[PDB]
Ligand binder design. Sequence first.
Ligand SMILES: C[C@@H]1O[C@@H](Oc2c(-c3ccc(O)c(O)c3)oc3cc(O)cc(O)c3c2=O)[C@H](O)[C@H](O)[C@H]1O
Lengths: 289, 6
Amino acid sequence: EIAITHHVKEGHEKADPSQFELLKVLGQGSFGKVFLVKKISGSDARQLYAMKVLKKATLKVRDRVRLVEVNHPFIVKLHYAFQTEGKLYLILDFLRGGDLFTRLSKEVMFTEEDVKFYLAELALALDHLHSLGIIYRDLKPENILLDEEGHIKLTDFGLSKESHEKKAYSFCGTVEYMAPEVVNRRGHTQSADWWSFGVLMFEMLTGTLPFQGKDRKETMTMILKAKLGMPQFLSPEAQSLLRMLFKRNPANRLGAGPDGVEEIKRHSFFSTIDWNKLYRREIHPPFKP
Amino acid sequence: DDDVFT
Ligand SMILES: C[C@@H]1O[C@@H](Oc2c(-c3ccc(O)c(O)c3)oc3cc(O)cc(O)c3c2=O)[C@H](O)[C@H](O)[C@H]1O
C-alpha cells in the first residue's frame, strides 16, 4: 500500500474536509480522479487546489529542519494531508495535464544535452527544498513529475510502497538511491540528496542503476563497498560530475560545501545552462508531453 | 573507498 510523507512547516494550520469548496472533478490520466477545490478559510482562503482522496494509504508527518511561502517553478507542494473515515485527503498544487517522469524515461533515450536540462531544473528544485528544511533521503524518479509544458515538478512530499508480520518502520526508502550514510542509518544531511542526484544522473545517462544486487542486502553492500567502472562513452564533463557526486564521505561530496548547490551549478557539465533563464521557464524542454 | 569509480 501507499505511504505519504508530509513535511510540515512550523505552525501548520491543520485542515479537514469542511474547509474546501468543491469546484470540478477531472480525469487526469496517470493522476486518476482529481478534485479541483477552493480553500474556504485561513491564510490561503480562496486559493484553488487539487484534491486526491486515497482509500488505502498511510500518512507520516515529519518536521522540517528549517515567511509566507511562494510558488517555485519546479516544485509541486503538498499543502494539507488529513485522515477521515478510512480516507486520506491530499491537498496539492493543481497540476493540469501533468505526467510522470518515469513515463518519459521509458519512452526516450536521453543524450547528455537532454540530461543537462532535466538535472538543471531538478537541482534548482532540490536546493529550494533544502532551504525549506526538507531532506529527501531517497530521492528517486517516482518523486519527479512533469508539467503540461514538459518542465520538472519535484514533489515536496514522500511516497513509498510499504507492506503484518513485517514490523513497521518510520522511514522505508528505496535502497538503490540511498547514500552510504543513509544506508548505515548514521547520517542524513542534505549532502545525502546530492548522492541521490548522482544516481538519478547515472540512470538517465545509462538507463541502468550504478548499484544493484540480487536483494536489498547485496545492494547495501555495494553502496558501501563496490568499486564501479565509469562508463567510457560519457563525456569527460559527465564523468567528472559523477565522480564528484559519488564520494562516500558526505563531507567530500559536491554540493556539501558552504556554497551548496552553486558547486554543482558551476561544474563544467552545466556550463551551457543559463540559470536565470531556466528559473524563468524560458528554456524549452527536450521533449514536449 | 571514498572514490566510488576508477
Ligand atoms: C498520491 C498520488 O496521486 C495521484 O497522482 C498525483 C501525483 C503523483 C505524485 C507522485 C507519483 O509518483 C505519482 O505517481 C503521482 O502528484 C500530484 C501532484 C500535484 O501537485 C497534484 C496532483 O493532482 C497530483 C496527483 O494527482 C495518483 O492517483 C497516484 O497514484 C497517487 O499515488
